[PDB]
């Protein structure tokens with residue numbers, strides 16, 4: 396199983412590289428890591444499991460974060476009363492379309508590869524349409540908005556060598572953009 400020691404930290408050259416496109420079908424090994432990535436997410440969200448292994452709860456993981464420079468991500472956004480949840484292991488994900496309108500998490504964002512809390516607002520597109528392939532090479536189209544759009548943008552950013560704090564305005568780090576929806 397993947398643990399915290401497998402997670403590389405900010406400073407590692409791999410987190411700043413542009414991850415490589417995957418050929419399809421995936422190799423047996425690429426399928427296993429993606430499954431292991433999703434499983435790490437499932438474990439981290441379980442209070443008991445997370446406590447036994449000391450995992451930080453998270454809803455997204457990108458391959459570069461476990462030192463694998465390939466374009467694959469795992470997104471596991473739980474429900475918590477709404478009836479809307481997301482569980483995806485995607486390959487070669489790309490935002491094909493998106494709004495001009497922004498959205499942001501009021502408390503900013505965190506990242507398993509960044510050990511210290513960085514303050515500031517991360518304005519992302521409020522709505523996005525994504526294209527990707529799943530673990531079997533099947534096509535996936537997803538239309539997302541709000542929090543789920545933000546999670547996916549954070550993960551895709553990792554494939555391009557972008558960190559959440561790259562989006563923080565250094566002069567006015569905490570000023571919300573006009574017409575940006577708070578999530």
Ligand SMILES: [Zn+2]
Pocket residue numbers: 505506507508549
């Ligand atoms: Zn992150």
